[PDB]
Amino acid sequence: NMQWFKVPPKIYFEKNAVQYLAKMPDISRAFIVTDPGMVKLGYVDKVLYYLRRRPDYVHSEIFSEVEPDPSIETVMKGVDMMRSFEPDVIIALGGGSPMDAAKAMWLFYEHPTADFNALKQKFLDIRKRVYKYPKLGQKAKFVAIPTTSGTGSEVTSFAVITDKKTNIKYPLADYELTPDVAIVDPQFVMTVPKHVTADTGMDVLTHAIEAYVSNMANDYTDGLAMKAIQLVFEYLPRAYQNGADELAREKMHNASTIAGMAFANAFLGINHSLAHKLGAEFHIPHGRANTILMPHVIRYNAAKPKKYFKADQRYAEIARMLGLPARTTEEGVESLVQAIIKLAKQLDMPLSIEACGVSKQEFESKVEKLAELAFEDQCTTANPKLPLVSDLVHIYRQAFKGV
């Protein structure tokens, strides 16, 4: 009946936070996990530069062959290199893919006695307050360095790896995979194109709102989630209109992590469940799908359940702090909805599934399937109210019309 709050014990941020790698104690062998993109932009060179500046010599190995939605094959390939190389630090540089991929290798590197076939079956129960295999004695430290703003994976214990010969998406639980250090350096976000600045920027906002109305929300996550929401409405338009705006980028990158610290402990809701499946089926970007769904999900969650429920009031708290009309809970909710629609328009994002290129026959033929899968999504468990599959169908249909 108790609750817990967990984050990386050290988060370094502001520009050139990456320079900590020149100061970080007790590291002689670094295993860098990333993708070809970060290598292309010389971001890996940036990391290696500060390791060279250490008084003692540092041997480094690079693992760049990481694909979106990392597979087990990719993981075990990395583990094999790690076991021969034996790093005392693992540096995950990139988006959610290299982050989750690196976390997975870290697990099997530290626990050679672990089997993936076993992990496939055991599921993440978000009611549990202790890891079966927590961090006790590890041979390598884990440093997360996100390059988007963002997934906030640099503060979570969540690692997901796809199977391919099945294609089921498996979250890895029982093992504690929270990074030892998170380096939130905005210099890595400077180059992000504007249409994904908008996508990733709205996922941060979705993470924070969902974390705030989650049935796991607490005093510790509430303040962080609220702050994240504030920062997005303040600087995401600026970051979009001008990606050279250093202040706007610094704020969004922090908001991404702060939103992460909230949902790492409070989890999410059906918005991500609905977006997971909608985006995988029609190849719609994650944050783009979240924006289309948000107006309709908030209205559903705000609807007092058929009959202690507070989701409607909590949505109004966000409006009230945003300085929006919330004299009553009902209008406060709709104010928040309208603010999000305005923002979405500023970022030139679609506001319907139909606007994305999806037919109405292509959609109606898949809606029952996605609704059922969405319900099955782990994130549904933390939604302020457990929905019927029919509730998710209705939301999807409203989302197709748009708003």
Place this chain on the structure above:
Amino acid sequence: NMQWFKVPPKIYFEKNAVQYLAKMPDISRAFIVTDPGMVKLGYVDKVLYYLRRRPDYVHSEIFSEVEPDPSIETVMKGVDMMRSFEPDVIIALGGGSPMDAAKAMWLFYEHPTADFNALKQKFLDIRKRVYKYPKLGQKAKFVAIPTTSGTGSEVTSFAVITDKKTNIKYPLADYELTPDVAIVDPQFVMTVPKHVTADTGMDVLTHAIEAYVSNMANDYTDGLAMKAIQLVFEYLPRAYQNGADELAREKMHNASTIAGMAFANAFLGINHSLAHKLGAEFHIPHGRANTILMPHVIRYNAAKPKKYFKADQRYAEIARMLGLPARTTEEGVESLVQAIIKLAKQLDMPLSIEACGVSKQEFESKVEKLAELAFEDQCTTANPKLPLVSDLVHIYRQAFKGV
């Protein structure tokens, strides 16, 4: 030029959070550091109860001879017992005194090669972003369990130990003393008398406000500080009027830790500097002294410096979020001041140094001394603007009249 944010990697909270000690992995020998008060209330029995419920036998040693403002003699006495007992977990149960005392023993237990005479001279530079002696390989885990709401010491790396044959107060730096686990259980706060509920409750508010206008404030600490401020204005009156109010106690205990997470990284200001010396000289309780000074310190810090300064605007942000009139920065500031005066009155607290029993001759004879010492206080370094000793004299004089 980078910044960092650090907290205990695991914070357990809500009622019966102490039950984690039955689940906490890899502990066979517990060294409990506390004071006679916690033993009297059976709080130590509560801790020992859950250690017994572990599958494996747990040998426990208790160290209760801890006095307010712990001395080095107390520390080295504890270390000697630890070295013979060899605990794999240290449990600090109590207020700031047993917490700081336990942290100090932990240092010398883990680092037998450390000298206090050496630590006396090296000072806490709050510009540094790496510990000279961080947590790498420790033979004992540190569990902090606060019983007041509170000092928030259960999340800081700050340990202070008095000398007596000198009586200089020495913060211990270079060594990383952040607890591995913080257990914020409101069952330990239920019995706190109401006049100290008010004192400790207002110190939380002082920690949060100072952390928010500190020159070290950042996106991560701002959200936490703001949340803390909200919780106090909402539940501190309730906690005062009725100490059996379980919700009010749970909220204040969380607010204490959340305020801690903010100032652990953002530090404080002259309010604590002024309160440290005022309280040590006239034996005025910490939070009681902070309340008398706050109206006058906020007005000073809000005053635009003689000539990027934002302290005035940030004070108004607190008023605005509190729903107070802040149409302009100037009135927003004064609104916050008035809200604090109202609160102080609800808690039946004094509003002047004279109201505490201090004469006007007893005061005027000491004011230069305290002002000079206040300036010298470490906390002054993080104040939004560096004050002259004369500025601190004026504040002290305004505080004597009251408001």
